[PDB]
Ligand binder design. Structure first.
Ligand SMILES: CCCCCCCCCCCCCCCCCC(=O)OC[C@H](COP(=O)([O-])OCC(O)COP(=O)([O-])OC[C@@H](COC(=O)CCCCCCCCCCCCCCCCC)OC(=O)CCCCCCCCCCCCCCCCC)OC(=O)CCCCCCCCCCCCCCCCC
Ligand SMILES: CCCCCCCCCCCCCCCCCC(=O)OC[C@H](COP(=O)([O-])OCC[N+](C)(C)C)OC(=O)CCCCCCCCCCCCCCCCC
Ligand SMILES: CCCCCCCCCCCCCCCCCC(=O)OC[C@H](COP(=O)(O)OCCN)OC(=O)CCCCCCCCCCCCCCCCC
Ligand SMILES: NC(=O)C1=CN([C@@H]2O[C@H](COP(=O)(O)OP(=O)(O)OC[C@H]3O[C@@H](n4cnc5c(N)ncnc54)[C@H](OP(=O)(O)O)[C@@H]3O)[C@@H](O)[C@H]2O)C=CC1
Ligand SMILES: CCCCCCCCCCC[C@H](O)CC(=O)SCCNC(=O)CCNC(=O)[C@H](O)C(C)(C)COP(=O)(O)O
Ligand SMILES: COC1=C(OC)C(=O)C(CC=C(C)C)=C(C)C1=O
Ligand code: SF4
Ligand SMILES: [Zn+2]
Lengths: 114, 178, 118, 83, 385, 43, 198, 95, 112, 339
């Protein structure tokens, strides 16, 4: 315990920042899908944003959250100030890779080490 | 000890003669004409290029070039699979697995130099105790397909047999130095 | 002023590891033993934690070993058992620590070999 | 075929690699080439095989040709010597 | 501001550079250079490689000054081992170090001109450069990427004809500098393109960590070759070519002078090279000679262990800086007692210089930026590492 | 014994300083040439 | 055996004491290596203060920042060891000030003290993940635009987790989990025998 | 070389330099190949006597860094003597 | 008197002795607030007093440049006010205080 | 066989050595893609010069893709290609009867010899591809001839899977590009004003994935799957929709086919790959057959992908700078016809 605060004194204040970033991404998804001529649906993309913002829903510690948005903000900057081209963005969608089943029987049938 | 480049020691006050000389330099592009003279001069010099296929740029004995595995004059391949050529390769290029040959001798079942992985450092040439793996003189082994560049024991041994005469001469010239 | 958190530093969210290799990878914290070949003990001093071994299928074109597991060759070295356990907890990898086993003291004396009755 | 009896089975598909191409092998095989060289009949119990050529050869080693039955063989050249 | 990126394929971008330019009209108001296009992981790979098998990596960080780069690793590792190279080896490293600064400067001056538009200076000097590589190839076997300068001493003795051939090259080389000297030093067109462009003030240069010809060009007098004499730079006499004002011309003129001053140092090295051994005689650090390893057991054991395992340098950490042609090249090598390093931070004269591009290229046209990168002599291998 | 070393007595001396030659016609004389061409040409 | 002059090990040693005395609130340890190099060690909070004193003190002017790096000792609670190497063109001496930073406990930025650090601090964030407060523009410099993970951390796999190839179906470059055709052979090299007391 | 005198004269003039004296192309001046065999010198430590390594191994006689000011009147001292001003060159001070 | 200083950006400062005496006396003043036995106050006061004393003593700038080193006199001016700025900064920083916090144990043990 | 080891991506092994004779094709390109992605051994018989098959090299890994010189008239070439393959996939097809190859050859004659040899070789399974709705009596010589083949090959190779795809939707396809390219033509003829020829497109990948899945599944033997699609369409909406995404005017004007078959004959006379074909024309207005059959997609494991979803990528090249940035959302969808 006894940790020093990075930018947010408590999960509460930190959550404020997450809200802002969500908004940012939400407002940006449409633009990217147009400035990058990505073949995705704005709605679809906006769900992806939600996915990511929740993939890390479990974090309880304020410090971890604060870094997470710093990093998140940095990603947005790379996508609104466009330095990240389609190949970079579409990677988020994991479009080419073949999905792996998580069913035990499925894995048994395919991989030595699951 | 230092030296001022582009530092004007003093303020030469313009003298008509000086001014004219300068003004002429700007008006009649005198220095520009100086530069043209230099290039006209070389136009008359003999060109340094070599007919590449017919003539070849000189390489002395230590040139590393293309990997080869040598054999003893008797015909027994030199490598005894100590495998430190694998240990010191910086790129992880050489892969060696061995087993005692029927004769009972130590020999490598598989010796694979991945030339695309290899950065031609020449340490393998250095490390080998029997000096079985050598940096051969040939540099012209460009290949249409990536697989051809990966080399197994048979290609390297064959490379060794083809270039053994020159490899022996090259090692002969440089061994005193090493 | 400092803030209070009872949450075990877990930073699994910042490390940047693919989900599969954080939830399916068991790492073992062990002090390396000595290959019996040599009698030196300088490699049995520091604790090491090593990730579980994974597939090593033969490659069809050249027969080289091929591996799909990124965390295979990684063995991190930690000076003390407590510190290594900490690394597993904050990185979220499962751990199964093995106690160091050091040679027990053995009494030796050249005289014994010349014992009247041994 | 190769030095080590490396012969892709009649059903293996790496044989496709050799389709329309030469599987590189060397006629000159060492196991045989060393045999040709005759046993050197030295007259000293222990002789040394520097490898031929000294520094241009292999690490120097001394062989004990004492065993009357067998012949000493340099772990390096494979050359054999008998007393 | 019409954001435009100087994309990698463009020739002026050194192959990999994505300068996000904001064009306020043709005048460029901001640059945000996006390096990283050649980050190879050079310093995470070294941690997994023994000290000798990591030498090669140092020949590829700045790829135009190979041996001077591998003289920084060699000095570092040598410090951490409290071993010093033999006298002949130190002269050979100074001989090869100045051949590399002539080689880097021919690279920097001629390619800068290629960018500005002068094409002939590159061809005349590049023929003089293959004459020089030959010296690398004749001493190491590689035209470039030699691996000749080893962590302890150098690898093999100079062939018996090299010093005569280096004299013949050095004897006639100065006319060759004189010739581009006439063709690209007073041309009003060069001066206009280079003079008063990218002026950097003295204190700003120190603050931005420029540390190189960029430091010397604005008049600060700093050469790690005279201030902190590494190797034998204490027994050779040369004049640092300090420039006065800082425009890209004064920096060019300084680079042309250093080529001339290096010919003065090369002359001294050929005139005074000592008879002796080229690598320290401790088999523990430098590998045993080919004849010895094949006749003496202590030498085979030392050859086997050194090639397979390593020097096992004593635990410690050092920052060793040498004056690489670009500027101060330093290796912060942290070492555990193990034969393979723990960290190797390559300070690249170039990471600091490229940062200065935004400040230096202020109130400047699209064309000026091409000169600004050219006068930093930036090779992205060193910056990207 | 035989190692590659500087020849006895040392090598000869090598030039490093710029040898650019200030060779040209004096400015006044130069002007006259062009001016003369014009003066004559006009006549 | 290298030649060592104790003049320096004495000069530098004294300076160390001088710095320590002048900045006792932050200096924890000040040592001189056997290689004649000083290495003041400061509490992370002393980043701004200790540097500034060295950049602007008549008896210790350390104008340029040679390098900013972060070794990562995973065992150490504070994982990173930010090391700042500085040079004094006036006194021809270099010093190194090294602090400790954990993954989520950021260090102050010195871009104010030396603007050289603007880039190196971005380099330390990209590779190791330490964060620098008050940095003008902290953003990945060396890694790819979408890279996930900090690469030079000792806990990051060399080959990494993603590699790129061009896929025709999608006519665009596409990441895939790394599949290597010859894994990095991890030679064990440490010998079981020590060398000296050290 | 091998240039008719007139071309050489034009060359020398247009360039403003006796380029013939220092031609770039190399002709029979370069070290001949197959220079004689080299017998290189063996350095110190090859003595067969009084050559104990313990007396010549700086590798690990090195000791752990000396520590000052560990956490666990007086005159001012500088990092080192103030540097000495460099002196202008004498062969070619300027240019 | 001189035409210009070697350093590109720096400009010749006329009345250099007066400019230095102004800056040197100021610093001495600011230092007067530092805690009495504060290490920075005793050390810098000693350095600044010697610098002034020399500036007061020498009426020739070229010899002044030799006496307190500093290369060109203009640099010495920059170093003095840079120090004046830090003296003001450290009073706020209060670095004369005891160590902020002891290093976590084993934090500085390199063999690891 | 080859035990499947690996994690599933390139540089891994799946154990499918497969000759694929017509890989250079639009469908083919995709078939090699998945087969290569999976890690299967792919032998690609080719006749066009090496320059044209380079696009296939990066697909698949080293020593995973092998290219063999092969001539349809020469039986020996087919013989050696299947020597060491255990799966043979036949995608040989064309739309324009070429001077030296007739629809019979490309569809029935050649694809027979191939499977014939494959059996002699002992390949475990052969997949033969024939166009959808292919009656032995269908109007287009092409479709009928293809029908003729699917029969024959069954006698040369029994229990040989016969996937029968509809016209395919994909980048580089004809179905979608052809109509979009009618732009050059000021007017876009549409028989029956593009009505009563409901059509169900199928994404190329879906087809490819399906085909690949066949290779690695015991359930498919003698099966005649029909990859169809996720939605049907009257040719009218399709044509307009296309023009819609292309953002080019749509002017549907009916053209009596009797005359139009003649237009196909015209371009057909073209020496360099006639753009339209008499046999094409009929096919285009040949109504898509209904879906009562061994199911293909989904049945073989891939859920079909709606046309509108990826149409944007296929038709983008045909737009003008003005519409390039425009996206699918801005545009409208076409309407299906369960009829
Ligand atoms: C045009 C009139 C002739 C020009 C001429 O002869 O120039 C060379 C001749 C010698 O010049 P160089 O630079 O000393 O030649 C190098 C060797 O000395 C001489 O070179 P070399 O030692 O190689 O001599 C052999 C050479 C000798 O060749 C020649 O010297 C005559 C070349 C005639 C070109 C016409 O012949 C060849 O090697 C084969 C090439 C022959 C000419 C090929 C081009 C012919 C073009 C025909 C259509 C135009 O030029 C002069 O005598 C002074 C010219 C001053 C011009 C102002
Ligand atoms: C035979 C081929 C002759 C080539 C001559 C040019 C290349 C050789 C130059 C050698 C050299 O370095 O000296 C230059 C010299 C070098 O001089 P400098 O620049 O070093 O300085 C001398 C001049 N002062 C001292 C006053 C500054 O330049 C000159 O002498 C002046 C050249 C003036 C040129 C004016 C423009 C060209 C002429 C335009 C009018 C038309 C003329 C005829 C055109 C054609 C008609 C058919
Ligand atoms: C009564 C008259 C008295 C004498 C008058 C002389 C008139 C000269 C006519 C041209 C004048 C050109 C001139 O004044 O210089 C302009 C420029 C150099 O001027 P600059 O140094 O930029 O001065 C800066 C001030 N703003 O000049 C230039 O930039 C020149 C750039 C030239 C680039 C190509 C140069 C080629 C030179 C060789 C060919 C010259 C032409 C020869 C053939 C002519 C036709 C036969
Ligand atoms: N819309 C569609 O694409 C549909 C296709 N199909 C079927 O799917 C298969 C693949 O279609 P698709 O890829 O578009 O066809 P393509 O026109 O793309 O050609 C397919 C391949 O067949 C090869 N080929 C054609 N004629 C000959 C010949 N005489 N000798 C040797 N090789 C030949 C071509 O090789 P090369 O170019 O080197 O000659 C090409 O690589 C076809 O057979 C077709 O019947 C079925 C329904 C719809
Ligand atoms: C189309 C392109 C896709 C790109 C998507 C986007 O750029 C990537 C991205 O989401 S960037 C990372 C976002 N990640 C955070 O910003 C941290 C969230 N932090 C939490 O979730 C906490 O656990 C909290 C306590 C707030 C739970 O509360 P809550 O569930 O959010 O309400
Ligand atoms: C000398 O500096 C550099 C160049 O500019 C002159 C480059 O062109 C390039 C690349 C240029 C091409 C297109 C060969 C490199 C790598 C470089 O280092
Ligand atoms: S070192 Fe020479 S001998 Fe030992 S294995 Fe490598 S090659 Fe064969
Ligand atoms: Zn032998």
């Amino acid at each position: 315990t006894s940790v020093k605060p990075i930018f947010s004194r408590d999960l509460n204040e930190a959550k404020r920042r997450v809200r802002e970033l969500y908004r940012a991404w939400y407002r940006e998804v449409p633009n990217t899908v147009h400035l990058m001529q990505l073949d995705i649906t704005v709605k679809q993309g906006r769900d992806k944003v939600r996915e990511m913002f929740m993939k890390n829903a479990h974090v309880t510690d304020p410090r971890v959250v604060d870094l997470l948005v710093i990093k998140g903000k940095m990603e947005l900057q790379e996508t609104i100030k466009v330095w990240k081209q389609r190949t970079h963005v579409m990677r988020f969608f994991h479009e080419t890779e073949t999905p792996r089943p998580k069913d035990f029987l499925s894995k048994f049938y395919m991989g030595h080490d699951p | 000890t230092y030296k001022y480049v582009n530092k004007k020691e003093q303020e030469s006050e313009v003298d008509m003669k000086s001014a004219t000389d300068n003004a002429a330099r700007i008006l009649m592009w005198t220095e520009l004409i100086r530069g043209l003279g230099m290039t006209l001069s070389y136009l008359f010099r003999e060109p340094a290029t070599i007919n590449y296929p017919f003539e070849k740029g000189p390489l002395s004995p230590r040139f590393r070039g293309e990997h080869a595995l040598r054999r003893y004059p008797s015909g027994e391949e030199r490598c005894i699979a100590c495998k430190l050529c694998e240990a010191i390769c910086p790129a992880q290029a050489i892969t060696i697995e061995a087993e005692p040959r029927a004769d009972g001798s130590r020999r490598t079942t598989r010796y694979d130099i991945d030339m695309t992985k290899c950065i031609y450092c020449g340490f393998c040439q250095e490390a080998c105790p029997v000096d079985a793996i050598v940096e051969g003189p040939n540099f012209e082994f460009s290949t249409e397909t990536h697989e051809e560049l990966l080399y197994n024991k048979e290609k390297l041994l064959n490379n060794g047999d083809k270039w053994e005469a020159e490899i022996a001469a090259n090692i002969q010239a440089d061994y005193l130095y090493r | 002023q400092l803030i209070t958190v009872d949450e075990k530093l877990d930073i699994t969210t910042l490390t940047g590891v693919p989900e599969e290799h954080i939830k399916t990878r068991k790492v073992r914290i062990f002090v390396p033993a000595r290959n019996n070949m040599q009698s030196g003990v300088n490699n049995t001093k520091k604790w090491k934690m090593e990730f579980d071994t994974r597939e090593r299928w033969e490659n069809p074109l050249m027969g080289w070993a091929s591996t799909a597991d990124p965390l295979s060759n990684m063995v991190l070295t930690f000076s003390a058992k407590e510190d290594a356990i900490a690394f597993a907890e904050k990185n979220g990898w499962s751990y199964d620590v093995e106690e160091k086993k050091v040679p027990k003291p053995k009494s030796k004396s050249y005289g014994a070999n010349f014992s009247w009755n041994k | 075929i190769t030095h080590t009896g490396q012969v892709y089975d009649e059903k293996d598909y790496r044989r496709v690699r050799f389709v329309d191409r030469q599987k590189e092998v060397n006629e000159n095989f060492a196991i045989d080439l060393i045999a040709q060289q005759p046993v050197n009949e030295v007259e000293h119990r222990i002789i040394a095989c520097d490898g031929g050529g000294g520094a241009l050869g292999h690490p120097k080693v001394y062989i004990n040709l004492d065993k009357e039955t067998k012949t000493g063989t340099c772990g390096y050249c494979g050359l054999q010597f008998k007393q | 501001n019409m954001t435009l990126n100087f994309g990698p394929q463009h020739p002026a971008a050194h192959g990999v550079l994505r300068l996000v330019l904001e064009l306020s009209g043709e005048m460029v108001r901001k640059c945000d250079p996006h390096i990283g296009l050649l980050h190879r992981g050079t310093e995470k790979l070294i941690e997994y490689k023994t000290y000798l098998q990591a030498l090669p990596y140092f020949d590829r960080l700045d790829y135009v000054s190979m041996m001077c780069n591998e003289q920084a690793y060699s000095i570092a590792v040598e410090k951490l081992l409290n071993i010093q190279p033999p006298p002949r080896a130190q002269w050979i490293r100074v001989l090869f170090g100045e051949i590399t600064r002539i080689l880097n400067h021919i690279m920097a001056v001629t390619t800068h001109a290629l960018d500005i538009g002068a094409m002939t200076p590159f061809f005349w000097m590049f023929e003089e450069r293959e004459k020089m590589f030959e010296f690398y190839e004749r001493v190491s076997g590689a035209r470039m990427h030699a691996a000749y300068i080893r962590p302890g001493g150098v690898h093999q003795d100079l062939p018996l004809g090299l010093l005569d051939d280096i004299y013949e090259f050095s004897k006639n080389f100065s006319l060759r500098i004189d010739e581009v000297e006439e063709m690209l030093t007073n041309n009003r067109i060069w001066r206009n393109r280079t003079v008063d462009i990218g002026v950097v003030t003295a204190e700003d240069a120190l603050n931005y960590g420029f540390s190189g010809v960029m430091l010397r060009g604005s008049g600060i007098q700093w050469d790690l070759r005279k201030t902190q004499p590494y190797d034998v730079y204490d027994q050779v006499e040369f004049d640092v070519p300090i420039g006065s004002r800082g425009d890209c011309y004064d920096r060019y003129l300084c680079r042309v002078e250093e080529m001339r001053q290096s010919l003065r140092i090369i002359e001294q090295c050929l005139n005074k090279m000592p008879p002796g051994e080229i690598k320290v005689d401790d088999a523990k650090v430098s590998p045993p000679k080919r004849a010895e390893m094949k006749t003496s057991m202590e030498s085979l054991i030392h050859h086997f262990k050194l090639y397979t395992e390593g020097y096992q340098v004593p635990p410690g950490a050092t920052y060793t800086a040498i004056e690489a042609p670009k500027g101060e090249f330093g290796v912060y090598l942290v070492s555990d007692g193990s034969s393979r390093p723990y960290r190797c931070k390559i300070k690249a004269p170039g990471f600091a210089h490229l940062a200065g591009l935004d400040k230096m290229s202020k109130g400047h046209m699209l064309a000026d930026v091409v000169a600004i990168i050219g006068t930093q002599d930036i090779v992205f291998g060193e910056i990207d590492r | 014994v035989k190692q590659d070393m500087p020849p006895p007595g040392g090598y000869g001396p090598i030039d490093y300083k710029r040898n650019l030659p200030r060779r040209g016609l004096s400015g006044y004389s130069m002007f006259a040439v062009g001016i003369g061409a014009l003066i004559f040409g006009y006549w | 055996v290298r030649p060592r002059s104790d003049v320096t090990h004495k000069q530098l040693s004294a300076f160390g004491e001088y710095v320590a005395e002048i900045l006792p609130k932050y200096v924890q340890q000040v040592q001189v290596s056997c290689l004649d190099e000083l290495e003041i060690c400061i509490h992370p909070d002393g980043v701004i203060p200790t540097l500034t004193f060295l950049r602007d003190h008549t008896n210790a002017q350390f104008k340029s920042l040679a390098d900013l790096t972060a070794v990562d000792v995973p065992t150490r609670q504070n994982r990173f060891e930010i090391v700042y190497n500085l040079l004094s063109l006036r006194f021809n001496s270099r010093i190194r000030v090294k602090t400790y930073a954990d993954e989520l406990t950021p260090i102050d930025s010195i871009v104010s003290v030396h603007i050289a650090a603007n880039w190196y601090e971005r380099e330390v964030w990209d590779m190791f993940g330490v964060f620098f407060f008050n940095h003008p523009d902290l953003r990945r410099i060396l890694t790819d635009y979408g890279f996930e993970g900090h690469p030079f951390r000792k806990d990051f796999p060399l080959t990494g987790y993603v590699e790129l190839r061009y896929d025709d179906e999608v006519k665009r470059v596409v990441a895939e989990p790394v599949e290597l055709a010859q894994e990095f052979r991890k030679f064990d090299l440490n010998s079981p025998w020590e060398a000296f007391p050290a | 070389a091998s240039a008719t005198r007139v071309i050489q004269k034009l060359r020398n003039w247009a360039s403003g330099q006796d380029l013939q004296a220092k031609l770039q192309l190399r002709y029979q001046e370069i070290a001949k190949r197959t220079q004689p065999p080299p017998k290189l010198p063996v350095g110190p430590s090859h003595k067969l006597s009084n050559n104990y390594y313990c007396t010549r191994d700086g590798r690990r006689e090195v000791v752990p860094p000396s520590i000052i000011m560990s956490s666990q009147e007086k005159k001012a001292v500088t990092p080192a003597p103030p540097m000495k001003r460099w002196e202008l060159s004498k062969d070619q001070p300027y240019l | 008197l001189k035409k210009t200083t070697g350093l590109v950006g720096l400009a010749v400062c006329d009345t250099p002795h007066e400019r230095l005496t102004i800056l040197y006396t100021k610093t001495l003043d600011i230092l007067k607030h530092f805690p009495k036995h504060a290490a920075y106050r005793k050390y810098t006061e000693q350095i600044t007093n010697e610098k002034l004393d020399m500036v007061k003593a020498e009426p020739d700038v070229k010899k002044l440049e030799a006496l307190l080193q500093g290369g060109e006199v203009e640099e010495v001016i920059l170093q003095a006010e840079k120090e004046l700025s830090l003296a003001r900064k450290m009073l706020k920083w209060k670095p004369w205080e005891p160590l902020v916090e002891e290093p976590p144990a084993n934090q500085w043990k390199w063999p690891i | 066989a080859v035990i499947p080891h690996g994690k599933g991506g390139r540089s891994s092994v799946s154990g499918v050595v497969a000759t694929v004779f017509g890989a250079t094709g639009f469908l083919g390109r995709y078939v090699v893609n998945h087969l290569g992605r999976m890690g299967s051994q792919v032998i690609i018989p080719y006749r066009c010069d090496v320059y044209d098959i380079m696009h296939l090299r990066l697909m698949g890994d080293l020593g995973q893709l092998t290219f063999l010189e092969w001539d349809a008239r020469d039986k020996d070439s087919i013989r050696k290609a299947v020597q060491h393959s255990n799966v043979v996939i036949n995608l040989i097809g064309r739309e324009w009867e070429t001077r030296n190859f007739d629809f019979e050859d490309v569809f029935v004659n050649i694809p027979r010899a191939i499977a014939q040899a494959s059996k002699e070789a002992g390949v475990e399974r052969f997949i033969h591809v024939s166009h959808l709705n292919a009656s032995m009596k269908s109007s287009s010589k092409s479709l009928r001839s293809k029908a003729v083949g699917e029969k024959e090959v069954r006698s040369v190779f029994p229990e040989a899977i016969i996937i029968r795809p509809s016209d395919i939707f994909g980048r580089e396809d004809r179905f979608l590009n052809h109509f979009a390219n009618y732009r050059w033509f000021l007017a876009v003829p549409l028989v029956s004003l593009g009505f009563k020829t409901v059509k169900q497109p199928v994404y190329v990948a879906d087809v490819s994935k399906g085909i690949v899945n066949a290779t690695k599944d015991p359930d498919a033997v003698g099966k005649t799957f029909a990859f169809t699609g996720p939605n049907r369409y009257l040719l009218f909406h399709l044509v307009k929709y296309i023009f819609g995404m292309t953002h080019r005017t749509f002017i549907p004007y009916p053209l009596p086919l009797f005359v139009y078959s003649w237009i196909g004959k015209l371009f057909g006379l073209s020496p360099f790959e006639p753009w339209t074909t008499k046999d094409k024309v009929e096919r285009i207005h040949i109504s898509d057959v209904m879906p009562t059959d061994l199911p293909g997609l989904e049945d073989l494991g891939v859920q079909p992908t709606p046309l509108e979803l990826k149409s944007i990528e296929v038709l983008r090249r045909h737009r003008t700078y003005r519409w390039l940035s425009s996206e699918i959302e801005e545009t409208k969808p076409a309407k299906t016809v369960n009829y």
